[PDB]
TrEMBL record:
Binding site for Ca(2+) 3: 214, 218, 302, 304
UniProt region (Disordered), positions on chain: 46-76
Alphabetical keyword list: Calcium, Hydrolase, Metal-binding, Metalloprotease, Protease, Signal, Zinc
Name the UniProt record assigns to this protein: Neutral metalloprotease
Binding site residues for Ca(2+) 1: 131, 133, 135, 137, 175
Binding locations of Zn(2+) 2: 203-204, 207, 230
Length: 399
């Protein structure tokens, strides 16, 4: 038969748990196509020093003014300093340009797409931004984000840092997110296509209003865990595109780290982050199909005042199943990826968007599995679940 093994511990900081002494009664058991399958971004953590910004009502900058911003070199993880020009001063977005290759037209396309589609989309379905500089607008700094693309082929499409909302070192004292030019817009610096990154505007803007709702509007001031913050950003991309994120599915299908038990809830900052993006994306889409209010569950997760696991558990009880615990919903997620049943917990309600999700069976179980790390294997015998496995490990017969 086949088995889905999962560490059911819902604590992302928990131990990697022993899977047991099992019997090799297992069967012995290409290439991510799109370059966009290797597109990352960075969501940085809010500072513990939440010194507020004080101002005394924000008609400082206008078209063609220059402004030097702190940006982040993701090769070395240092602050850098970048001087940009305001090239679009719109209804909500101010688009700053600091890449000589970007034309004024492209800045105007980006700002207009934000003003007309990105902003309403996010405000109505996720949340609304802060206004720490009392200027009614948000900054979009368009420039060549520094990363290891030239050496790896993995590139950073954009980022958001909640430090910009407080008075700390490196803050730009405003609502701002950062958008990459090369190679996000294309691999030819002289023929960049800015429409390539429009869904990334929704991605980064979700991070921004997420930080506002949870750090400014709610009294607990608890950040959402990265894995679910990132999942909600990719829910917003699909909603903007009204199409599945096929590159994240493509990456899922070819990821050896996922096949060997990559964690849904522990963000592998120094390792294969792309596998975290793929798992976070499929999870939020699984929650969408399993919720009776569909995409409307997204704003309830943000609006919930409790921590990340409490919000998910409340959403499951109200919209999915009042008796179902978060930890078993997560196991059902992994089985749903395999079975894709047309109804019930082991599928995506037959949504065609997810029919090309194909988990990869492996020949041997890893010794240990991180919290919500999962693997799939097949058996040539009536294999027996090991008796010395960690109690957090569930073996789930499927076929
Ligand atoms: Ca503002
Ligand atoms: Ca770049
Ligand atoms: Ca909340
Ligand atoms: Zn992100």
């Amino acid at each position: 038969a086949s088995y889905v093994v999962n560490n059911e511990n819902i604590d992302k900081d928990g131990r990697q748990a022993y899977t047991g002494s099992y019997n090799r009664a297992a069967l012995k058991q290409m290439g991510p196509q799109n370059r966009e399958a290797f597109k990352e971004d960075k969501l940085f953590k809010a500072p513990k020093n939440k010194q507020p910004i004080r101002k005394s009502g924000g008609k400082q900058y206008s078209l063609n003014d220059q402004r030097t911003f702190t940006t982040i070199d993701n090769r070395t993880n240092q602050d850098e300093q970048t001087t940009a020009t305001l090239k679009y001063d719109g209804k909500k977005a101010q688009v700053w340009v600091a890449d000589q290759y970007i034309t004024d037209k492209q800045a105007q396309n980006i700002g207009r797409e934000f003003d007309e589609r990105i902003d309403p989309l996010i405000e109505n379905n996720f949340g609304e931004p802060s206004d720490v500089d009392n200027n009614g607008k948000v900054n979009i700094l368009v420039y060549d984000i520094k990363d290891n693309y030239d050496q790896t082929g993995t590139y950073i499409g954009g980022y958001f840092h909640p430090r910009d909302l407080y008075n700390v070192r490196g803050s730009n004292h405003s609502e701002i997110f950062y958008m990459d030019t090369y190679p996000s817009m294309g691999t030819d610096r002289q023929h960049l296509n800015e429409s390539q990154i429009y869904s990334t505007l929704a991605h980064q803007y979700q991070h921004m209003v997420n930080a506002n709702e949870n750090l400014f509007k709610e009294q607990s001031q608890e950040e959402m865990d990265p894995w679910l913050n990132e999942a909600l950003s990719m829910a917003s991309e699909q909603m903007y595109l009204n199409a599945p994120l096929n590159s994240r599915i493509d990456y899922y299908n070819n990821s050896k780290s996922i096949a060997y038990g990559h964690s849904l809830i522990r963000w592998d900052e120094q390792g294969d982050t792309l596998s975290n993006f793929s798992l976070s994306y499929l999870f939020i889409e699984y929650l969408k199909k399993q919720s009776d209010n569909g995409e409307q569950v997204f704003k309830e997760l943000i609006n919930d005042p409790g921590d990340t696991n409490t919000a998910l558990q409340n959403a499951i009880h109200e919209h999915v199943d009042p008796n179902l615990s978060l930890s078993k919903f997560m196991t059902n997620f992994r089985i749903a990826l395999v079975k894709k049943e047309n109804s019930g917990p082991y599928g995506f309600k037959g949504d065609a968007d997810f029919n090309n999700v194909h988990p990869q069976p492996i020949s041997q179980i890893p010794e240990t599995l991180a919290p919500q790390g999962s693997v799939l294997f097949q058996t040539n015998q009536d294999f027996n679940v090991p008796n010395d496995k960690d109690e957090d490990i569930s073996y789930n017969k499927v076929n």
